[PDB]
Amino acid sequence: MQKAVVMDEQAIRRALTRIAHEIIERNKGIDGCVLVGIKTRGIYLARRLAERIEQIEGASVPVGELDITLYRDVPFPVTERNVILVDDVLFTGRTVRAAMDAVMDLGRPARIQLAVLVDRGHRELPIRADFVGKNVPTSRSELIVVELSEVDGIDQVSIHEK
Amino acid sequence: MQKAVVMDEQAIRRALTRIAHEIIERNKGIDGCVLVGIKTRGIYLARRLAERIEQIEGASVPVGELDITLYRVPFPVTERNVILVDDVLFTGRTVRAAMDAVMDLGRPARIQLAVLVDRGHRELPIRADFVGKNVPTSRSELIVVELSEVDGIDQVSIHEK
Ligand SMILES: Nc1nc2c(ncn2[C@@H]2O[C@H](CO)[C@@H](OP(=O)(O)O)[C@H]2O)c(=O)[nH]1
Ligand SMILES: Nc1nc2c(ncn2[C@@H]2O[C@H](COP(=O)(O)O)[C@@H](O)[C@H]2O)c(=O)[nH]1
Ligand SMILES: O=c1ccn([C@@H]2O[C@H](COP(=O)(O)O)[C@@H](O)[C@H]2O)c(=O)[nH]1
Ligand SMILES: [Mg+2]
Ligand SMILES: [Mg+2]
Secondary structure (H helix, E strand, C coil), X not given: CCCXXXXXXXXXXXXXXXXXXXXXXXXXXXXXXXXXXXCHHHHHHHHHHHHHHHHHXXXXXXXXXXXXXXXXXXXXXXXXXXXEEEEEEECCCHHHHHHHHHHHHXXXXXXXXXXEEEECCCCCCCECCCEEEEECCCCCCCEEEEECHHHHCCCEEEEECC | CECCCCEEHHHHHHHHHHHHHXXXXXXXXXXXXXXXXXXXXXXXXHHHHHHHHHHHHCCCCCEEEECCCCCCCCCCCCCCEEEEEEEEECCCHHHHHHHHHHHHHCCCCEEEEEXXXXXXXXXXXXXXXXXXXXXXXXXXXXXXXXXXXHHCCCEEEEECC
8 A cells, every 4th residue: 555655756857867967977977888777667767867868968878678587586788888787676686686697697897886766775685776866764564666657657656565 | 015004903803893793783693694704814704703703692603615716514505694704895796706606506595795894996786784994995006904814913904016
């Protein structure tokens, strides 16, 4: 039962924009930078980011896609390139680990970074994002729902409880 | 040229005792926990912690050894709390291989990393759960961790070319 809306379109906007700036700044430009979406809602975020970057720096960033289905609970630039994984939500980090494995299976990255719209904590591996839209503390039970216009009709992040 | 000394026998002694209490407090008891040192000094660091934790909680924590050059008495892993132990966290690339190792052998409940020092310059989204000490450094500089079991004495230092 949707407890509360944590992020509205506006917030999602401001966060995404800030992150774009962060990314450019932490890499001193976007040359050698590749954005990679982890699953459906991560590809869209990654696409938006590239869009912003494209807007701020006047140069475009390559975008890759990763449908981490090889999670047993088209190629893109890699070698000596800065692979920036993008995902909407970060929980245990098991998905990011796979993403890493995949990325490196595909070449020698100069380094891989992580950007997520939200970090709900409860990590299970020594992993952390380099860019975070918003930390949303949560209970192990609770579920974070990220809705994105490209797929859900609207932009909104919310917490649901059983 | 050794730029300095950033950690001596006393700093190290404290850092580990802290981390030992830290590990315990963070898992609400060492039950289910396991230590896994990375390379030689990583293994000794693991043993020191195991000893302290024991001195502290009384129980004992298994200590496994892991080499990373092939990755560049069965040991508990699956459903255990795997605490990787290494002396220096640099690019994080070594920890990545170590995870791959661990998760290839079994399915751990969770994996945690503990290091004596973290000199930054991460090249992967990896971070220690427990850190002896952060020592900012230049890409050029080199951190040297000396441990009595191998180097005759305990001391961490920064060297410059
Ligand atoms: N209903 C439901 N959704 C989950 C559960 N675990 C994760 N999710 C999230 O629900 C979303 C889709 O409605 C997914 O977002 P994603 O695109 O970040 O992976 C997924 O992450 C779960 O147990 N139940
Ligand atoms: N949006 C969302 N996905 C979640 C959440 N918890 C787990 N997941 C799922 O877990 C994957 C990553 O899980 P993790 O490795 O971070 O625990 C995501 O791609 C998603 O399918 C949550 O709170 N929100
Ligand atoms: O100044 C340094 C940096 C790294 N290392 C070695 O590199 C490992 C760190 O791996 P990584 O994070 O560079 O991948 C350490 O345990 C250590 O054996 C050193 O000896 N000195
Ligand atoms: Mg996601
Ligand atoms: Mg080491």
